[PDB]
Design an enzyme around this catalytic site. Structure first.
Site, PDB file in Angstrom:
ATOM      1  N   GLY A  99     -21.414  -9.355   7.418  1.00  0.00           N
ATOM      2  CA  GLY A  99     -20.389  -9.687   8.379  1.00  0.00           C
ATOM      3  C   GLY A  99     -19.045  -9.323   7.791  1.00  0.00           C
ATOM      4  O   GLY A  99     -18.946  -8.751   6.699  1.00  0.00           O
ATOM      5  N   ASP A 128     -19.395 -16.500  21.106  1.00  0.00           N
ATOM      6  CA  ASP A 128     -19.846 -15.188  20.623  1.00  0.00           C
ATOM      7  C   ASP A 128     -21.280 -14.924  21.073  1.00  0.00           C
ATOM      8  O   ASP A 128     -22.093 -14.405  20.324  1.00  0.00           O
ATOM      9  CB  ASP A 128     -19.713 -15.093  19.087  1.00  0.00           C
TER      10      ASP A 128
END
Ligand SMILES: N#C/C(=C/c1c[nH]c2ccccc12)c1n[nH]c(N)c1C#N
Ligand SMILES: N#C/C(=C\c1c[nH]c2ccccc12)c1n[nH]c(N)c1C#N
Length: 334
Positions: A47, A155
């Site tokens: 990430g 998200d």
């Protein structure tokens, strides 16, 4: 003259009547597990703020997933931890199994249950009509649960829905952008993946709520039943709203903007143009028709609405006839 205020039409004051400790993540005191219980096996991905590994719990030889957090505001880490602990045990919510750190460097990591996922780019190609209904219902259970617990995911997208297909097992993951809902709060609109951003985010309307997740979910549904992933494919955030407008039409967009007294960037109305609302049937072709039904199109139509107050709630969505056969299957004597 600023924008008209808004509040969630469901679960509006869930955090209001909770003890401060429930939502005051800043004051949360972390209970640390033992780093030496886990062994990293393979890197799964990276990430922007973390590195994700497949790992093994050496005390019981069970697979887990370890997310090592890069240096960042402690406030952000504490928010994700508090949210994951608050939702633990909820339907189809990824289980946070442990929280550990290097005892010397203090570099922390989150430990999650392992899901044997099939990457969505492969899996969605093979899903049946019933599979889509089933997994949509599972996602709705997760979203109704987290919304009822005063939390927005912010998200929702295929990459954050892990599916072990042979066990029909679904988990909603990556709660790093999730936040507690407080009525009247003006939130950061820089959340969600471009393709799944709701109209409210794209026009900088900050007083949004749980219904943002329902837009994202509708984007996923469209991508699955029409076999077009992502469904709304913009090249930047401005163009993203253009892509939506080409389908939902510009009249309902400008009605939305007007209702909330939203000030649009001058550049928008030149690129938005004028577009009729399209019939959802237009996107049905020979190759996806076995995934499309009147019920699917009616349900999708009720998710993908400009006005966030007009979208189905997760609970209302689970009542839709699209899910009739799924609901019977879930009615389990066990
Ligand atoms: N190797 C390595 C690293 C290991 C760990 C740091 N804390 C941890 C907590 C639990 C398990 C492993 C680590 C690491 N520390 N800091 C990074 N950016 C890393 C990476 N990759
Ligand atoms: N990335 C990521 C995560 C899982 C996976 C990514 N590729 C995979 C391939 C095969 C099996 C699991 C994963 C993940 N992120 N956060 C969690 N709780 C996770 C879990 N499980």
């Amino acid at each position: 003259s600023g924008p008209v205020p808004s509040r969630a039409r469901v679960y509006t004051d869930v955090n209001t009547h909770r003890p401060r400790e429930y939502w005051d993540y800043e004051s949360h005191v972390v209970e640390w597990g033992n780093q030496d219980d886990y062994q990293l096996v393979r890197k799964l991905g990276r990430g922007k703020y973390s590195e994700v590994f497949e790992a093994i719990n050496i005390t019981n030889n069970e697979k887990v997933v370890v997310k090592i957090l890069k240096p960042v505001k402690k406030k952000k880490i504490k928010r994700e931890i508090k949210i994951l602990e608050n939702l633990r045990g909820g339907p189809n919510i990824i289980t946070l199994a442990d929280i550990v750190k290097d005892p010397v460097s203090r570099t922390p990591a989150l430990v999650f249950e392992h899901v044997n996922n099939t990457d969505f780019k492969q899996l969605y190609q093979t899903l049946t009509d019933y599979d889509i209904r089933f997994y949509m219902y599972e996602i709705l259970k997760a979203l109704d649960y987290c919304h009822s617990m005063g939390i927005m995911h912010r998200d929702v997208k295929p990459h954050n829905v892990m599916i072990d297909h042979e066990h029909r097992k679904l988990r909603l993951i990556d709660w790093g952008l999730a936040e507690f809902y407080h009525p009247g709060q003006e939130y950061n609109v820089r959340v969600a993946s471009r393709y799944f951003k709701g109209p409210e985010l794209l026009v900088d309307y900050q007083m949004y709520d749980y219904s943002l997740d329902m837009w994202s979910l509708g984007c996923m549904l469209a991508s699955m039943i029409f076999r077009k992933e992502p469904f709304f494919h913009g090249h930047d955030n401005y163009d993203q709203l253009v892509r939506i407008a080409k389908v939902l039409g510009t009249e309902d967009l400008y009605d939305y903007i007007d209702k909330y007294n939203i000030e649009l960037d001058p550049r928008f109305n030149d690129i938005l143009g004028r577009h009729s609302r399209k019939r959802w049937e237009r996107f049905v072709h020979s190759e996806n028709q076995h995934l499309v039904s009147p019920e699917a199109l009616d349900f999708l139509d009720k998710l993908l609405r400009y006005d966030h107050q007009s979208r189905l709630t997760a609970r209302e969505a689970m009542e839709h006839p699209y899910f009739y056969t799924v609901v019977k299957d879930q009615a389990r004597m066990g």
